[PDB]
Amino acid sequence: GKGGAKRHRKVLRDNIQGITKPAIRRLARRGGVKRISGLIYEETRGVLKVFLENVIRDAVTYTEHAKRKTVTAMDVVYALKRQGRTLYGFGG
Amino acid sequence: RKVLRDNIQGITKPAIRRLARRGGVKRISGLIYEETRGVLKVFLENVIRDAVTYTEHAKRKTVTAMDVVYALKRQGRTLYGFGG
Amino acid sequence: PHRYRPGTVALREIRRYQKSTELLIRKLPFQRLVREIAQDFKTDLRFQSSAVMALQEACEAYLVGLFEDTNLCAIHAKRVTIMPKDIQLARRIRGERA
Amino acid sequence: KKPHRYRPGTVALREIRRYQKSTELLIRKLPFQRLVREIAQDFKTDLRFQSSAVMALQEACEAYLVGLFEDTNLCAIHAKRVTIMPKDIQLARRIRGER
Amino acid sequence: AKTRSSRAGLQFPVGRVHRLLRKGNYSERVGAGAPVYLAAVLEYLTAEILELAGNAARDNKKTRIIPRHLQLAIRNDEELNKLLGRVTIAQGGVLPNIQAVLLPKK
Amino acid sequence: AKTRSSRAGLQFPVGRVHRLLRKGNYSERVGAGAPVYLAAVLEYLTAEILELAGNAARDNKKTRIIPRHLQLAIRNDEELNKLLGRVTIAQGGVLPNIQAVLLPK
Amino acid sequence: RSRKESYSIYVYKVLKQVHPDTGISSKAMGIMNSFVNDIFERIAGEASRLAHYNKRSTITSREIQTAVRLLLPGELAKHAVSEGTKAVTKYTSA
Amino acid sequence: RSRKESYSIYVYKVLKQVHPDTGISSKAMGIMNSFVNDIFERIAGEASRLAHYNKRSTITSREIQTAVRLLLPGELAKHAVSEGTKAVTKYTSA
Amino acid sequence: KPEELRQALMPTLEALYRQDPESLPFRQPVDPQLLGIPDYFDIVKSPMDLSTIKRKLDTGQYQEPWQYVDDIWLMFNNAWLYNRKTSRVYKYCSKLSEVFEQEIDPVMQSLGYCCGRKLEFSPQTLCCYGKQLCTIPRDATYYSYQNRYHFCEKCFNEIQGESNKEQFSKRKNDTLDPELFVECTECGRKMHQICVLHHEIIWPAGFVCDGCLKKSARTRKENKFSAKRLPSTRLGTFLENRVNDFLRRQNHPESGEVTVRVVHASDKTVEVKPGMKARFVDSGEMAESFPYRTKALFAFEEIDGVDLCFFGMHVQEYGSDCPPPNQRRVYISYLDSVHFFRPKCLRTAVYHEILIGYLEYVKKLGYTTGHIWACPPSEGDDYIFHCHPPDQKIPKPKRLQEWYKKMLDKAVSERIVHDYKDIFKQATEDRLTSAKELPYFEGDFWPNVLEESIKENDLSQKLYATMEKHKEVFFVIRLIIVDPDPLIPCDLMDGRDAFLTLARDKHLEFSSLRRAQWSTMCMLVELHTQSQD
DNA sequence: TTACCGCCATCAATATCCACCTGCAGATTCTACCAAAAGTGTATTTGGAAACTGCTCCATCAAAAGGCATGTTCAGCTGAATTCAGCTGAACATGCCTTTTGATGGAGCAGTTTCCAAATACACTTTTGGTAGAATCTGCAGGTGGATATTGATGGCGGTAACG
DNA sequence: CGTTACCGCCATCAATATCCACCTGCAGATTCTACCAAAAGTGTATTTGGAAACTGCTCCATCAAAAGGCATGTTCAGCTGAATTCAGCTGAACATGCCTTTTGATGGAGCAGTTTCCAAATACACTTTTGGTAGAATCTGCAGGTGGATATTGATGGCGGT
């Protein structure tokens, strides 16, 4: 077949479509779900996208305030806790 | 003071029906009311204690509405119009 | 004998109560229950009238919100009648139960 | 000669037990990194990301997804069902108040 | 003889909010422009909420703003609803909303 | 002569708790017994969560406490779950639970 | 009697500016006061946390601006930031 | 290379009284540190707000005792209050 | 004209380009050397890309939209053939093809054409002239003569004698015959013959398109070769009345009247095979031959003012003057259907109204037992109608048996059928003890089983076991002779084989509504011309 | 050729909307006094902007690999269709207790004065916790033999129905 | 009434992967020594915040009455919730192909540590303006009752098709 470069050259799948079908399947199965509708995944993908701008933007709002262009895990923890989604283990 | 007992029944069936209707509920099964009462009780058990817990912290014996605002705010139920 | 079909009067009074804001719980039984619970927590306790009114109004608002959630959850289950599993699921998802 | 085939549901419950007894991350590292980088460049360009920040955000993401999926399972069961469909997600996010 | 409230072109009190910030034990030091910023932000928020309340009152043929109008204004705006998502309004009621299947299904 | 933690019969540092209270801008003044009381409360909470985690590890045939054991200990205790109802444990997972309707037959 | 501070008159002028012929009731006025005060402790706590994160012992307009962006959603956030920036510039221009 | 304060050796020390023959991992130890920090922050904030509400300028053992009673569930709160009282009595008699 | 086509053709190319980044590999010419193996030109004889399409549409090499469509489809075919199926390139090509289809139809429909899909026929199995019972499966090498005679691998060594040596062209079974084009005399435009329903016999003067007909304000001449003009028979009239009454009481808005005609009826005889002839006939236990009457039927509907055939029939009727056990028996040899019936929902029921209507007919004549073989055709096999549509699902044995049972339950509710059962229950019902006691039908499965087993009192238990394996497949219906209908000789459709041969020769297929209507009108013309000759 | 369910048409019994008019608690306008703020004006102190720089670690890129993406066949799913015992809604009679207006003893909240134990601010000495390097120990992650445990397939036996 | 063959259920066995512990190298966890700025503990003078003591005083608890907006109990059938069946079909399980993912190594964009120093922040004493607010007077939007025109529901007359 067709050769050439391939590694990191075929990011073709859209940004949110980066998460694979079996990945969302595994996330649903861990929640005790045993059967998934075919068109659930993309919707959850959209839901996932929403969560991102719930936290990342706020974390970005932290990072720009500290005169930093590199985001830290402490910024992420503060952004998570400010929405009531406290995370432990990354406060060091 | 007299030890009041069994006044959870004072939340009458029509009253629970009215609260459900204000919630837009159209049909109510027979066993809804008492269930809500228990949930109602739980909510009071969630708030009153905390409000009561405020009272002795001020060395008082009367519960004020400001401690009520404090308890509702601390339980994520912030209320307006009664101070604070 | 004139009789409306089941639901027409229900919708009428639902609209009536959605256009009104007056408290639907009479003050005295709720005040008595609050006194009972506080006495179980601490005896010889006194209550401001404003505190009792705030308790009653907050409880009515919380019940209205949980009833909105319960109704919409019953709509989810292709039903128009609420049965305690709706309230249980609503409270569980709200985090009040699990 | 019609080889062995598990009935639908046995393997599902088995792997559900497997993943509930384990704690490892499920989302692949590279696609999630690309997603985070792209949505960050959506807000601010030329950003750099710490490995710890990325892994913390990822772990919070699998936690949020597993919680919403458990709520979705409860919602699907609530309607006398076993399969999840979009209105379950909608009800879960509505009760959570995000929508 | 110019107050800091009029100096910033604001109606909300700069001095009072500065004093409240100092009294709240939020920080050991408070900047000079901090009360001005608080006054401007609070005045803006009050401005839009009062404008929406007045619009709701006009929609109800009322000239006095009541808590029902406040609830109608807050819940009809997605941003204000998100801002006050965990606040219950006194004597405000709820938005008129009946689900589809609850309507007659003839 | 003696550290405040030793004088109060506690293992957590009273002085560090007092310093963190002072630096947190929570109050202009902090009482002497407040750091002792808070250190005692923290020590009790740590001791009981560690006891539950060790019990879970022993039930899991393990002698080292891992975040999975911490999650099992916290979720299996009703009041610990209530306290940490809005807290996410890293690398902890969820409790094994299958609903009745999902079960076969 | 001890004085009980409130924002009655300032919100009254705000209402007059936005609606000259519209009044306010006492209960709704208390709701307005409670809302403004609640915004006050929310923004103050956010600014204090921002000061604590960077080990900064002074809270300035920039920290409150960042906290406003954290708290206020979208158009409200940008408009509040713009109004506050204009007010701060006017204050420092005198 | 600034010193990063952490309760680490203390919590591990506590482990020695509760499980002499049981260890702890680094990730779980950071979990322990974050848990202790969060509980400390919650107790301190509740004590501060109780002090502010009563126009009380000093935080004592009573204030944080009330804070623990508000935040911590029933028998956990009872045990924490009892051990805090015992520690305060021991410190006073020390 | 080049510029004339652009305003319509360009949007499809723009939509193809809009697919990002799936369409990127097709934007530029694919260089065999650049991407690796240089065998691209060896496999793909004529490489082309999207840039070549743009250049052709700019300069104007395209004269008709069909050239553009053919080039796009040839691009898709090249991409599918060269690249492997599981490759992402194949998936991108398929997505681009789907995007092209979901816009090409209205665009070129605005230009006066009917549809913009390159239609290729189904992989239908070919028959053999020599053995008469051998078929050529897919992915199998065969030998063809003038695309008219076919021989398989086994039949090459079976023929005695070569009757030049290098005169038959070696071919492969991947060839799909293109659709024929007819040109309007007045306009000169060539377009597919099927969508215009133009036949050389009905209109020998020439072909006139709809545009030219509307230009002169004149309509096409009426067609006297319709299904309604076919001779009427008592059985056909009965079935027509039954279907019409059912559709009238249904009162479906989309329902249309259905015409049923019997176009063939002939007397034949079935001969006992050598094994059973030797075992039973010579002993005098059973006669050598069984006489019967075969009757062939079709069902038609008027859709869009055009006759359309949707149902077929082949039956064998052994009358009262036939030696037992075949006496007074009817056997359904083959049946076929086309699912373009309107309305669809009543369609299935309408089929019952035929079969039940048949059972009510012979029951009045004196026939007491019916025999149905629920054997659905395999993949690629067509019973009566040629090239069933790809979206026509072939019923499974279980579904087909349930359908048969359902009509029989309805008939019993209608009192027409006394009862129905499987063949084993009938064998118990008459206490079968010899192979002769079983009915003997031409082309039936049981005669072949008997022959093979004789080649393999053992007969009785053997045949009972074979009943046990495939009892649910075969239905025996108990209901409880002078046929009013005369004999109708028709060599064209006498047997499904000649009809299938005619359909294959003239490409009379049923893959689409237009193709099915063209086939139905072709058979109407052929039947109206065979009776005259 | 008698009864039954829909429909589009009118019509009668009701809840809704709303304009109108009157009493009045509440909203808005002044007069006045005012302690608590607001703010300008110096002295003092320090938070952090600015400039230079060592040290991370983050983006980029190489190959090795444990996974994921499609197609096939089918047991089970979900929902449409149907039927029905049952209940909760609408109506109504009866009356329970509400709902507010009224007054009153006094337990208790809060203001004012005095004043001492405790918190704070340094100043000093001491243990001490966090980190870096060495080195011994070790719980448990890949393989791997092993008993065992589950489950769908198949054959055999008994119940039963049907024909003679 | 007798006999036999079908259908259903149960006994019995081939096979797969999901377990189990055992075993071994090892990243990671634990133990110990040394150094030491950073806290931590002790001493002493200063300040002050809140405890006690008495009392002013607001509203909190408690008892009286009455009549009417609703709580409580009963009926019936309208119809929504619940149970049953089955057919289209969407997902589940699985073999096939190979590719995107994972791990390790390597330049410099900025994350942080150090140092100067100045615009900017407290601290506080007067001084002036101004926001709570006792009190009386006038204004005013709408609570509440009345009446009748305007929607909303339901099934009554009869026409009609299944």
Residue numbers in the entry:
A (entry chain B): 11 to 102
B (entry chain F): 19 to 102
C (entry chain E): 38 to 135
D (entry chain A): 36 to 134
E (entry chain C): 14 to 119
F (entry chain G): 14 to 118
G (entry chain D), H (entry chain H): 28 to 121
I (entry chain K): 1050 to 1212, 1227 to 1519, 1578 to 1601, 1612 to 1664
Show the paper's wording.
Here, we report cryogenic electron microscopy structures in which a p300/CREB-binding protein (CBP) multidomain monomer recognizes histone H4 N-terminal tail (NT) acetylation (ac) in a nucleosome and acetylates non-H4 histone NTs within the same nucleosome. p300/CBP not only recognized H4NTac via the bromodomain pocket responsible for reading, but also interacted with the DNA minor grooves via the outside of that pocket. This directed the catalytic center of p300/CBP to one of the non-H4 histone NTs. Representative writers of lysine acetylation (Kac) are E1A-binding protein p300 (EP300; KAT3B)8 and its homolog, CBP (KAT3A), which can transfer an acetyl group onto the NT lysine residue(s) for all four histones.
We determined the complex structures in which HAT is directed toward H3NT (p300H3-I·H4acNuc) or H2ANT (p300H2A·H4acNuc). In all complexes, as in p300H2B·H4acNuc, bromodomain of p300BRPH bound to H4K12ac of H4NTac, but the position of binding to the nucleosome was different for each. In p300H3-I·H4acNuc and p300H3-II·H4acNuc, it interacted with the minor groove at SHL + 1. Importantly, in all structures except p300H2B·H4acNuc, HAT of p300BRPH interacted with DNA through one or two basic patches. This interaction mechanism explains why H3NT closest to the linker DNA is more likely to be acetylated indiscriminately. In p300H3-I·H4acNuc, the density of H3NT toward HAT could be modeled for the C-terminal residues after G33 (leftmost panel). Since the distance between the substrate-binding pocket of HAT and G33 is ~21 Å, p300BRPH of this complex is assumed to acetylate from the N-terminal side of H3 up to K23.
